[PDB]
Ligand binder design. Structure first.
Ligand SMILES: Nc1ncnc2c1ncn2[C@@H]1O[C@H](COP(=O)(O)OP(=O)(O)O)[C@@H](O)[C@H]1O
Ligand SMILES: Nc1ncnc2c1ncn2[C@@H]1O[C@H](COP(=O)(O)OP(=O)(O)O)[C@@H](O)[C@H]1O
Ligand SMILES: CCCCCCCNC(=O)CCNC(=O)[C@H](O)C(C)(C)COP(=O)(O)O
Ligand SMILES: CCCCCCCNC(=O)CCNC(=O)[C@H](O)C(C)(C)COP(=O)(O)O
Ligand SMILES: [Mg+2]
Ligand SMILES: [Mg+2]
Lengths: 273, 273
């Protein structure tokens, strides 16, 4: 039994490897003591750790651990998953939409971080809570899926009206920019939450397409737990990526890229010269 | 009396020129009929118009009008204001933070639009209203200035804790990402509004610095009415621009760039070959 753990800001992702097969597990970072409880019931010779909370797991258990930097671990695990899933890409941007969002350019050989933004899953939860009082992640995301953004967001065509606009009229001109034009609307929790997911998706995708243009790649791979149980977010991102002439990729178990990467990096750290 | 009008999504900006001197006026786009009332009391031979609502003014009054595209009008008026204010820049990004945000690269000769995002003034107002029930712009912005974002936003150092992080620990990791860690906090209107201004500023600045890097300029000029009565927004943007090694510029009357640009373009449209 080997174990890779990516202990992030909101979720701890665990990949248990037992004889040619992955078992995937998640736990809330809030419940990190329960991950330690679990580890203490296993027969594990070594922990392969990454993520901001890796140090906390390592401090709190007597199993040898090695820590890897999340950006390299994520890149490496993602490279493995892409190849397993039949994608042999020469280069790509990857956008890791976790608690927050980190953007990387992979040139075929290694990753470099090319930007980031605090619009991600943490915003969906936190701003979602302020607008709906919902704390349960499944409830929040389920509620959002069929929300109508029309009374909340302003489009370019709302500003330009009968004049042909200088950029496409369907584009969002201002997230939440229609609220003051609809002050007698019922701003339902569903509608508000859809608009939160909308702005997060639009910001992420805009940054990803911008760095794809800068680094001359048409491929953009989207990973992170923020996509889980959020088909709306996936659609916002996929649609706008395609509109801007890039190819979006989503990866089965992509949220476990870092954990897979930690196991791989540990394995290949052992060499000599 | 010559008149330039930039009739935007939220504000109509008017520049009245009378014998070597500008007079600046603003009106809400909501009140566009009151701009037409005003125009009908003046002695104006021609209107120089730009912005999404230009067509509405032109349709509703019997004074000859010529319409200019806002991106060129803004660029040209901004170039005039920069030189008047002692800035002789070889190149720059300009970020027009209006109802929404439009980003341009000026290479010394002309502008091209290099991106945009729906995070801008309209979001400040609309999301601000959803979080505070305040509709008055001065009240909203004044309330926000001294808000404390600490119980609302998550920083990198909150995730990494005792481990040295791979990027600076003071950076926002997740806008609104601390809300679920402070569910018993008093989320005051001031604090919520500061966090709205924060995310808008951070997104704008992140996009501006990214395109500054792409187009190889260190100069970033920020214009738009979204900065009016919002010293907090100005500070968020200035600080993060400087952190990322770029030089921020704010322009006196920069929000009137388009209106000034329309008057100039009209003037120089008359030539022959
Ligand atoms: N079961 C869940 N509980 C809470 N958040 C979830 C869950 N599933 C998905 N998420 C979403 O995923 C985000 C975290 O993404 P992830 O890639 O795991 O980030 P991190 O590495 O920072 O923990 C959350 O902020 C939330 O939007
Ligand atoms: N008196 C005001 N009333 C309403 N909004 C204001 C006012 N002053 C500044 N603003 C801010 O400026 C934004 C509009 O910026 P501006 O550059 O004029 O945009 P546009 O060209 O789309 O009208 C508003 O969304 C708001 O955040
Ligand atoms: C004060 C100026 C604000 C500028 C901050 C905006 C930029 N912020 C960032 O680039 C960090 C965005 N967040 C991230 O990259 C990730 O959330 C990270 C901090 C790496 C932690 O990883 P995850 O737990 O996997 O999200
Ligand atoms: C559906 C996919 C969403 C992608 C939309 C995100 C990108 N949106 C944009 O680039 C438009 C941002 N807004 C602007 O550039 C301006 O608000 C504009 C529409 C030009 C109108 O000018 P202003 O009234 O001066 O703000
Ligand atoms: Mg992570
Ligand atoms: Mg404008």
């Amino acid at each position: 039994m080997k174990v890779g753990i990516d202990a992030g800001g909101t979720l701890i992702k665990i990949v248990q490897e037992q004889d040619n097969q992955r078992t995937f597990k998640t736990e809330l970072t809030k419940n990190i003591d329960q991950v330690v409880e679990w580890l203490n019931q296993q027969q594990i010779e070594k922990l392969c750790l990454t993520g901001g909370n890796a140090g906390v797991i390592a401090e709190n258990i007597n199993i040898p651990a090695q820590i890897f930097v999340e950006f390299d671990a994520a890149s490496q695990g993602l490279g493995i998953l892409l190849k397993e899933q039949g994608h042999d890409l020469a280069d790509y941007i990857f956008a890791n939409v976790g608690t927050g969002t980190s953007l990387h350019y992979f040139d075929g050989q290694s990753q470099r971080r090319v930007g980031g933004i605090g619009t991600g899953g943490g915003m969906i939860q936190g701003l979602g809570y302020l607008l709906s009082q919902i704390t349960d992640y499944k409830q929040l995301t389920d509620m959002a899926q069929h929300g109508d953004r029309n009374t909340i967001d302003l489009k370019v065509r709302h500003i330009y009206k009968d004049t042909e606009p200088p950029i496409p009229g369907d584009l969002t001109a201002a997230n939440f920019g229609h609220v003051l034009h609809h002050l007698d609307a019922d701003f339902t929790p569903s509608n508000k939450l859809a608009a939160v997911i909308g702005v997060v998706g639009e910001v992420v995708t805009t940054m990803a397409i911008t760095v794809a243009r800068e680094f001359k790649t048409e491929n953009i791979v989207y990973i992170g737990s923020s996509f889980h149980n959020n088909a709306l977010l996936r659609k916002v991102v996929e649609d706008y990526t395609v509109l801007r002439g890039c190819k979006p990729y989503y990866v089965e178990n992509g949220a476990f890229s870092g954990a897979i990467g930690a196991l791989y990096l540990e394995k290949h750290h052992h060499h000599h010269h």
